[model samples]
Target: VDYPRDLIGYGSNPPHPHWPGKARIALSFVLNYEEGGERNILHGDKESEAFLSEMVSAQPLQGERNMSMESLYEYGSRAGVWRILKLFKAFDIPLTIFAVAMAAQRHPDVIRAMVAAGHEICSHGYRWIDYQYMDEAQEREHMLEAIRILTELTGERPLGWYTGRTGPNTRRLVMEEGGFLYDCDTYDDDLPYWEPNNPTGKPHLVIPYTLDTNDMRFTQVQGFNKGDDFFEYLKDAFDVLYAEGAEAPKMLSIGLHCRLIGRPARLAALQRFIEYAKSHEQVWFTRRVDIARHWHATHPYT
Candidate 1:
C-alpha cells in the first residue's frame, strides 16, 4: 500500500494495563506550556497566534505584533501558571507539563517550579507552530534544539515527546534521535501501543493524547461554554470509565491549557473534578512518564 495506517488495533480485547495500587483507572493531567512559543513576529514568525485564545474568529496579523494576542498568552505564564501550580500542590497531584522549548527557556522560574513539584516535563517541541509545513531539515533542527534546551533546563533528557501539530517525519525523527520512552503523537486509544517499524528499528511506545477532554475546547464554538460545562463533561467521562474499570481498566487523560483553564472560573471546574475523582477508590493519578515505565515493565512488546 502507498500509505500505511493502522485502523484495526486491540479491537475488542484491549489489555488490562495492570495499573499500580490495584488501580482500576490511570488518570493523567497534561498542562501545555506554550506561551512564549506561539507564533509572532518577535519569534520570527510571519503572523501571530489566533487560535486557543478568548478571541473567537480571530485572524493572525501578518508581519506585525498582535499585542492583544501577546497579552492573552502572557496571562498564562504570569498569573495562570502560578494559580494552577498552587492548586496542584494543594491536591498533591502529579502533573505533566507539556513544556515547549522556547516557552520554558523564556521562563526559568516556571520551569524550576515545575521540576521542584516533581512533575514530568515532556517536550512539546521547540515552538507551538504547526510542524507539518516545515521541511525535514527544519523539523529535525527544531526537534534537536528542543531536546537540547529541555535537557539543559530540567537536568534530564525528556523521555516523552508530543509535537502538538506534527509533520510526516516527526515520529521517525524522534526515533532516530533516540532516548525517548514514548511519544503521545496519536489519539488512537486509551492504552499505549507500540510502533514496531521505525528509524531505530526498535518498538516505539506511543501514548495517545486527548482532545475531547481538554480545556482548549473553551475556545471552540461548539465546545465548552463555561467552567461547569468542562467539569460536567469530565465527570461524565470519569464515571463511565470508572464503571468499566471493574471489567477492563483504562486510562483517562485530561488536557489543560494554562491560559484557558487557569482562569478562576475554569479552574474551579478542574478542582471539582479532582475532588470528585479523589473520592473514589482505585483511581490512580500519575504522570505520563511513569505510565510509560509501568507499561514497559508490565506489558512489554512481544
Candidate 2:
C-alpha cells in the first residue's frame, strides 16, 4: 500500500499541550450529521445504508430502496437532531459537526442552526459510504465536492476532514488539497500528532478520534445496551483522563450521532455525562479547530 502506517506513536513521553486556561483535560464532543448522505438507490448508490442504524444485523438490499432504513435515518434529521442541539445549547457547550456535504445541503436549517449556535463544521465526506475500495480519482472528487458543498452551505471552508471509513489515499489526498488544518481519520492515539509521512512532508496534524467511546456502539451487539451503560462508560473514561490531566493534559473525543444518541433514552446518558464532566474543574470543552490551532502554536513539529 502507498499509505504508510505508523505503529509507534509518541512512544512514551507525550508532550504537554499547555492547554488554554491551564485545563486538565480538553473535551471535544463530535456530532455526526450524515442522515441525507447515506447510501441509497435513490442517491444513485447500488445499495442502501446498513451501517450504524438501530436495526441489528442490518444489511444493504441491492438494487432496491429500504423505506424502513430511510425513515430510520429521516428521524435523525427531523426529530433527533433538534433534541441533541437543544441539549448542547442548554449546556452552552461547543461541539464539532462531522457533516456530510449532501446532508448539509439537504438540510440548510440544520446547518444554519449549527453555525448560529457557535459550533464548528468539519467535512465528514460527500457521501457517508466507506471509501476503502473506491477509485482514487473518484474519492478525490468526493473530497473536493464535500469541501465545495460544505463551504457553500456553512459559509466557510472546513478546516478539518474525517472520512469515517477512509480509503488508503484518504489522508494523502487531504494533504494534497492543502487547506485542511487537520484530519480525524486516525484512531491510534488519545492526542493529536503530526503525520510524518504526509504528502507535504511538513507538519500535518492528525487529531485522533475515538470509536469505543462513540455512540455507534449502541447499534452493536456487544455495545452499551442502555443509557446507564453509556453514561457509566463515559464517566469512567472522563475520570481516568481527568486524573491523568494533572500530570499530562490529554483529550477526550466523544463521538455522537443524531440518530442513535438523539433518542430520548440514549440522550439521557449524554446529558448526564455532560453535567458530570462540567461539574469538574479544569475541563475545557473545545472545538477541534481550536485544538488544531493550539497544537500548531504550542507544539509545532520540529
Candidate 3:
C-alpha cells in the first residue's frame, strides 16, 4: 500500500538518460520463473492454483487434489521455459528472470543456462507466497531466506529484488538489506525514480513495472488469445515509446510467463515482436539490473 513518494514522475518534461547509441527506449522482458513454487497440494497449500490453468477444474478440499492443474503449471518448466530461452538466445538479448528460489532449486539446468547466457536473476520470493500476511520480522526472515537460497544457486548474490507481488514492508525490507540496485514493485511510472527508504530520506530506486503490457492479460483480461493481436499491441507500444525516446527516453517492461507467453503461438508473437524491434533504430535491449545500474550512474540518488 506504500507507493513510492514520487507522485508526478518524470512529469511532462522528463530528463533523458542519453542512452547508449541515443536509444529512445530501454526494452526488457521478464520471464517470471515460478513453476516449482506455486501453491500446490505438494506444498500443503489448501487449494491448487487455477488462475492461468486451462480451466478451474476443481478447487481442492482438505484431501482433494488437482493433478491436471499441477501438470499445466509443469508445462511451463518442462518445455515452455526452453522455448522462451531459445528465442532469447537466438536474439542474443539479455533479460531479467524474476526467479522463485524454490523453483530455481528444482531446476538447476535452467539456472545454469540463464547464467551462461548472461541473464539477470532477481529474487521473486523464498517461495511464490505473498508476504503481506507476515509481520515485519517474519517478512524479513522470509526475504533473507530467498536471498540466501538464490545466492547459493546462482553463485552471485542477487542485487535486484522484486516480488512483483509485494507487501507493505517490502521496500523497507529491501533497503534494509543493503544489496539491491533497485526494486520493481510499483506499477506507477515509465521510468526509474527515487523515494526515501527511511525517515532521513535515504534514496531508493524503484523501476516501476508494467501490467497492461504483460502476457498475464491473456489469462486475466482475455487481452490476447491470438499471436497477431499480441504482436500488434507490443509493436504499437514500442513504436510510440520509440518515437517519444526521440526527446525523453523511457523504459518498457514486457512481462512474460513461461506457461502463458511461452506457448507456441505466444512465442511466435514474441519472435515477431523481436524481429520488429530489431528492424528499429536506437533501442536498447537491456536487463533490469543493468537498467538500475545505468540510471544510478547517470542519475544518482540525489
Candidate 4:
C-alpha cells in the first residue's frame, strides 16, 4: 500500500527518522548465536528447538545424541558464526549480533572477533532459556548479568535487548538499570516509537523487529522446505516495501540463527536475498544501533 512520506517518517521535520536523502528502505540483518546450557526435550523447554520454534517453526532435524548442548553451542561459535561473519565482511555489510551472555562468555574468541570487526552486539539475555517463567526479580538479575557479561566481552555494553520468546517487567527494569539505547522487545509496528519509562517522562525507544520475513520461517512455518522458498518470500516482501519506501522509508529486519541459516544450503538463499537487496538503489542496509541512534538524535524523545 502507498503511504504518505510523512507517514513513513519522512518530510521536513518529519517524524523522528527523516532518513537522509532518498533512501527507500532500512534493512537490518541479525545473527542470533545462542547455544549453552543443557538441551531440553520438551516443546517449551530450554533447548534451541524450543526457543527457535516460537519465532520460526522447528524442523524435524535433530542433533546427535552425543552432541552435548555445550558442544553444539560451540559449533555455532567455532564454525557457523565465523562462516556468517566472513560473508558479511565480504559484502562489507554490518549486522547486529543478538548474543546470549552465556554463549558469548563461553566463546570469548567469537565475541572478540565480532567486536573487533565493528559489528553491533545486542543482548539476547543470559542464556537461550526463556524468561517468561521468571519473576520480576529473577528476570532483572538475568538482564543485569547479561549486560555485565556482554559488556566485558564486546568492550561496549549492549545497547538493545531481545528475549528468547518472552519478556518480563524486568525488561524495562534492565533497560533502566543497564542504560540501554533501545530494545527490540516488540513486533507491534514497523516504525520505532518512544515509550515513557517514568511518570516524570523518561522515554526509551522501542524498535519493533520482524519475524515474518525471517529465515526461521523456512524451518518452522512448514511450507518453506527449500532455499528457493525463502528467497522468493523475502524477495516479495522487499519488492513491496521497496516500492512503498519510495514515498516513505521503512525498516525491514531479517533474523537468522547460527544453527539454522548457517548451513551452506540456507546461507545460499540468504546470499541471494542480500544480492537482490543490494541491487536496489534506494535500500539503506544498516545496523540496528544506527537506526536507534538516528531516531534518538533526530526525533529526541519528548
Q: Taking the tens digit of each residue's C-alpha lDDT, what string does model 1 give over 123-220? A: 99999998887999999999999999999999998999999798889888988888899999888898888875676877678889998999989998
Candidate 3, position 77, lDDT: 96
Q: Candidate 3 regions off by >4 Å?
A: 1-6, 56-63, 197-202
Q: Write the per-residue lDDT of candidate 3 for residues 187-245, one digit (tens) a residue.
A: 98787777544543555678888888888787764577688887999998998888888
lDDT of 4 by residue, 71-102 (tens): 54456666778789999998888999899887
TM-score of each: 0.98, 0.98, 0.93, 0.84
lDDT of each: 0.91, 0.93, 0.82, 0.73
RMSD of candidates 1 onward, in order: 1.0, 1.4, 2.3, 5.8
Model 4 vs. true fold: TM: 0.84
TM-score of 2: 0.98
Ranking by lDDT: 2, 1, 3, 4
- Kindly indicate the candidate among 2 and 4 with the higher TM-score: 2
**Predicted structure 1: lDDT:** 0.91
